[PDB]
Amino acid sequence: MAVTITLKTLQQQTFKIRMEPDETVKVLKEKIEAEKGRDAFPVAGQKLIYAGKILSDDVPIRDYRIDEKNFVVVMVT
Amino acid sequence: MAVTITLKTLQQQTFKIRMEPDETVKVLKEKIEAEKGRDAFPVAGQKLIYAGKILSDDVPIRDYRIDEKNFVVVMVT
Numbered sequence: 001m002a003v004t005i006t007l008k009t010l011q012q013q014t015f016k017i018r019m020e021p022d023e024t025v026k027v028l029k030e031k032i033e034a035e036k037g038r039d040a041f042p043v044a045g046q047k048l049i050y051a052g053k054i055l056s057d058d059v060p061i062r063d064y065r066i067d068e069k070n071f072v073v074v075m076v077t
Numbered sequence: 078m079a080v081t082i083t084l085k086t087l088q089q090q091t092f093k094i095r096m097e098p099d100e101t102v103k104v105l106k107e108k109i110e111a112e113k114g115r116d117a118f119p120v121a122g123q124k125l126i127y128a129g130k131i132l133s134d135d136v137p138i139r140d141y142r143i144d145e146k147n148f149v150v151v152m153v154t
Contacts, residue, residue, distance in 0.1 A: 053140050059133045
């Protein structure tokens with residue numbers, strides 16, 4: 001069943017993205033870009049931080065075991 | 078400091094690869110191909126299985142927290 005990810009930006013703004021467990025980190029970034037815009041959140045610039053790691057694009061989201069009740073921090077470089 | 082990975086093939090053969098913790102799964106596969114040959118272990122065909130996951134190429138090996146005292150299974154498709 002779909003998983004909910006709660007994201008936090010450097011400006012302390014929060015928002016949620018729903019995805020399937022087999023969809024990758026790359027798909028999460030694409031969803032973020034749709035929600036937050038290409039101007040400030042282009043896919044290629046996004047760095048996602050969770051559990052002391054920088055999340056890798058081709059990993060299925062399930063493999064990071066992300067709890068809906070924590071935050072994934074989204075930074076842009 | 079370098080990490081040692083112990084691998085097992087489908088033919089029940091074992092072997093070790095030494096790498097740095099920041100080197101990726103892709104680098105592990107390249108090392109496997111050097112040790113085991115392009116004929117049977119081409120990088121593009123290798124699937125690495127550990128902790129109920131298929132290891133993703135661009136992830137630093139450290140992020141999977143692989144114990145030298147367990148096996149990473151290498152299959153080729």
